[PDB]
Amino acid sequence: VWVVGMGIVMSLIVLAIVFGNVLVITAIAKFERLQTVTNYFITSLACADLVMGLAVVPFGAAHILTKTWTFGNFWCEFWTSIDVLCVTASIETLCVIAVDRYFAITSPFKYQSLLTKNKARVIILMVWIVSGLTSFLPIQMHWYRATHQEAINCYAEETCCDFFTNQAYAIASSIVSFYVPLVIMVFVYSRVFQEAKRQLQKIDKSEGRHKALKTLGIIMGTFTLCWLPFFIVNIVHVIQDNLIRKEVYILLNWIGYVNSGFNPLIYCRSPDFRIAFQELL
Ligand SMILES: CN[C@@H]1CCc2c(ccc(O)c2O)[C@H]1O
């Protein structure tokens, strides 16, 4: 009396992610005024989110509902690799956008020289290749395999699908994918807030006779609340085995998936971009 219910919610999640990614991609592609050096990063992020929504979510949904993975083992390895790739690519694109905003605000005179049309494609390709090398190489080549009896029993079984890793690989993946971008974003947005406060004081210095907090708070809080608990649990269950069950792990992982859905809504809100929506519909 509960299978017919959660399926509807998961289908709505899939539809929302697909629609949110596709609308942004087509709006940027087919409209002349929208093209900008800063909009290419948004295009890369939208592509990563679309790949996530198209590939990762439905297969995991089917696996959760029917409780039996009705495909091979090569397919499950590929699915895990694609999931890791998409997650790390999304996070690194976020940190790249934050760094670009810092460069734009802190140094306005030299902003043109630092970033150009040629230098953005190279950065995007570098981000994508480092994201790909972190996931496919250690997974597709069986270098992350564990040494537990339950782990080998699960690995030998064809139908059963589950995730087991050694502690070292979990630590390395978490460090590469989450912590460093978070530190970079924190420093960037602290500096941006300081600059905004300084300008706000400077204006009221002469023009005699808030919003920055709202914007920075929403931008940081959405990402931090969506993704922070999952990586803490990721470290914890491999440092100590008894603490974390297999259901809390899945729930906290699935919490982070919805972040890709909200990202186009929070990042793309420019008035010209809404005008671009207006023409489409
Ligand atoms: C299938 N779930 C995976 C399992 C581990 C993992 C994820 C995402 C990023 C990482 O760096 C990881 O190590 C999760 O999406």
From Swiss-Prot:
Entry-annotated residues carrying Phosphotyrosine: Y111
Family: Belongs to the G-protein coupled receptor 1 family. Adrenergic receptor subfamily. ADRB2 sub-subfamily.
Ribosomal protein is among the record's keywords: no
Extracellular compartment segments: 66-76, 145-166, 240-246
Effect listed in the UniProt record for changing Y111F: Abolishes insulin-induced tyrosine phosphorylation and insulin-induced receptor supersensitization
Topological domains, Cytoplasmic: 29-41, 100-120
Gene this protein is translated from: ADRB2
Alphabetical GO biological process terms: adenylate cyclase-activating adrenergic receptor signaling pathway; adenylate cyclase-modulating G protein-coupled receptor signaling pathway; adrenergic receptor signaling pathway; AMPA selective glutamate receptor signaling pathway; bone resorption; brown fat cell differentiation; cell surface receptor signaling pathway; cellular response to amyloid-beta
Included range, full protein: 31 to 340 of 413
Name the UniProt record assigns to this protein: Beta-2 adrenergic receptor
Bilayer topology term: Multi-pass membrane protein
